Ligand binder design. Structure first.
Ligand SMILES: Cc1cc2nc3c(=O)[nH]c(=O)nc-3n(C[C@H](O)[C@H](O)[C@H](O)COP(=O)(O)OP(=O)(O)OC[C@H]3O[C@@H](n4cnc5c(N)ncnc54)[C@H](O)[C@@H]3O)c2cc1C
Ligand SMILES: [Cl-]
Length: 488
């Protein structure tokens, strides 16, 4: 008889889950398993993202319970847990979604070895990406495209991605009864207090497949807005109603299927002939995700500078004071400090907001390595994706994919073209709420009488700017030009 395990790591969803569909096929018992390392924090991870993962697991639990099953959160390491439950549960098949991250290949290789010893068939379908990214590389001649222009030509030659997989049955083969490793007291979903965190999460985005599908429909309520979507023209200062979909955390954890997102975009596109095209279109945004996954999975040391064949070697400054001020949102520039405050409170900022603070830290003002900025994003972003965070940090630092280092965002002017009153600033930096809009982006320029009348004296309640942008930007551009000339 067939007893199987569906191992959740990413792909925290029931829709478009070919691994789950194969696990339930002709199965007498199915064990939905997520492996939680209980000492993960005691070894980096904000409570905002970890609680998002936990809320995503609670959503899977309810979905399984509605179908007569149960989600099993096993404590420990996969290499130590699976060899035990293979014998205990009489497992004949192990199914999980393919993952191309560096740690994933080392972990999946070991588990695959352990399954062959126990006589367990391993099925690893691809469903986290639009395509089999290794197939894209093989069709391009054995190397991934290095520009979006050529990558879009490749996917158009390959054709449409696979359709979303059908929904699982309304009743699933259940786990066996009175199995010791499946005891409810040892397999339940923990809370954020139970894992070790002490401060509560403050983000307004809730995890889970149910929330992902709800945000998908909300985005498609206006098909005209989807058809004409142009990413560079969206508003980074919009926070009450974000200017983009905010589907990144759900695609990162696999709460939302990328193939379902793509399939519903094409339905809209067939009825709107003048729809936007890549790379600015909403579909083009999924291709940015696919493109960075394709290059990252085939590039060694893609998440670093040294040993990275696609990354340019720039001698970034080792400046802990600039890094600390940027990380703690005390740069003296309200536009920059507000985005960093949204980072630690929400764990999500608009794409152009991430452009502003990443340029400021790297090639724009402070000249700190993009690796240090990536480590700060990795801690707080609820959508932190190994390949996307690294690639976009190399883009903004002009270390790869992007080379126009003369385009430098102003920490003053960039925000006031969208938000002259500075509602985004007043929201996340309440200390500046009573500051007149004439000085909200440059509060040091406000006369002392206005600073006192607003209850925000620069140097006492809000710090002075750490650098003069005109001086600092002119220095970074000169050093970037020297770094490029030396990298022939
Ligand atoms: C320094 C920096 C770091 C970033 N780190 C991350 C990260 O860790 N995780 C992450 O998901 N994105 C990251 N991005 C990309 C981008 O800023 C976010 O994907 C975007 O803000 C998500 O909002 P949205 O879901 O509303 O996007 P939409 O515009 O609605 O796009 C829809 C989806 O397309 C994908 N997408 C959109 N823009 C990009 C892009 N530039 N690169 C790759 N995929 C994209 C995402 O999956 C996103 O959910 C980073 C960008 C910068 C500049
Ligand atoms: Cl600008």
């Amino acid at each position: 008889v067939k007893n199987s395990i569906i191992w959740f790591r990413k792909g925290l969803r029931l829709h478009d889950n070919p691994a789950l569909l194969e696990a339930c096929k002709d199965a007498k018992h199915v064990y939905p398993v997520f492996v939680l390392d209980p000492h993960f924090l005691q070894q980096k991870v904000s409570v905002n993202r970890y609680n998002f993962l936990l809320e995503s697991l609670e959503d899977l639990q309810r979905s399984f319970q509605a179908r007569g099953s149960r989600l099993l959160v096993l404590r420990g390491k996969p290499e130590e847990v699976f060899p035990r439950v293979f014998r205990e549960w009489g497992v004949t098949q192990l199914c999980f979604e393919h993952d191309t991250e560096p740690y994933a290949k080392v972990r999946d290789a070991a588990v695959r070895r352990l399954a062959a010893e126990a006589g367990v068939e391993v099925v690893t379908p691809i469903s986290h990406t639009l395509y089999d990214t290794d197939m894209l590389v093989a069709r391009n001649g054995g190397a991934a495209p290095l520009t979006m222009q050529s990558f879009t030509k490749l996917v158009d030659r390959v054709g449409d991605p696979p359709a979303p997989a059908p929904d699982p049955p309304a009743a699933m083969p259940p786990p066996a009864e009175d199995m010791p490793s499946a005891a409810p007291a040892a397999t339940g979903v923990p809370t954020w207090q139970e894992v070790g965190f002490k401060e509560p999460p403050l983000t307004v985005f809730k995890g889970g497949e149910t929330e992902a599908l709800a945000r998908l429909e909300a985005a498609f309520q206006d098909p005209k807005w989807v058809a004409g979507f142009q990413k560079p023209d969206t508003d980074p200062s919009a926070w009450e109603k974000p200017a983009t979909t905010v589907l990144s955390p759900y695609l990162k954890f696999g709460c939302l299927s990328a193939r379902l997102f793509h399939a519903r975009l094409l339905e809209v596109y067939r009825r709107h002939p003048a729809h936007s095209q890549p790379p600015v279109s909403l579909r083009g945004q999924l291709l940015w995700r696919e493109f960075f996954y394709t290059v990252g999975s085939t590039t060694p040391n893609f998440h670093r500078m040294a040993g990275n064949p696609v990354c340019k070697q720039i001698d970034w400054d080792d400046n802990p004071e600039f890094l600390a001020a940027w990380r703690e949102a005390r740069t003296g520039f309200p536009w920059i400090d507000a985005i960093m405050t949204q980072l630690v409170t929400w764990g999500w900022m608009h794409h152009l907001a991430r452009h502003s603070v990443a340029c400021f830290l790297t090639r724009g003002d402070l000249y700190v390595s993009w690796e240090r900025g990536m480590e700060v994003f990795e801690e707080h972003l609820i959508d932190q994706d190994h390949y996307l965070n690294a690639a976009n940090w190399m883009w903004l630092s002009a270390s790869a994919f992007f080379s126009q280092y003369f385009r430098v965002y102003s920490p003053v002017v960039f925000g006031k073209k969208y938000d002259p009153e500075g509602r985004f600033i007043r929201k996340f930096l309440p200390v500046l709420k009573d500051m007149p809009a004439k000085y909200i982006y440059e509060p040091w320029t406000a006369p002392l009488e206005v600073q006192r009348k607003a209850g925000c004296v620069v140097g006492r309640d809000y710090p002075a700017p750490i650098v003069d942008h005109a001086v600092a930007s002119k220095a970074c551009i000169a050093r970037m030009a020297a770094a490029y000339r030396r990298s022939k």
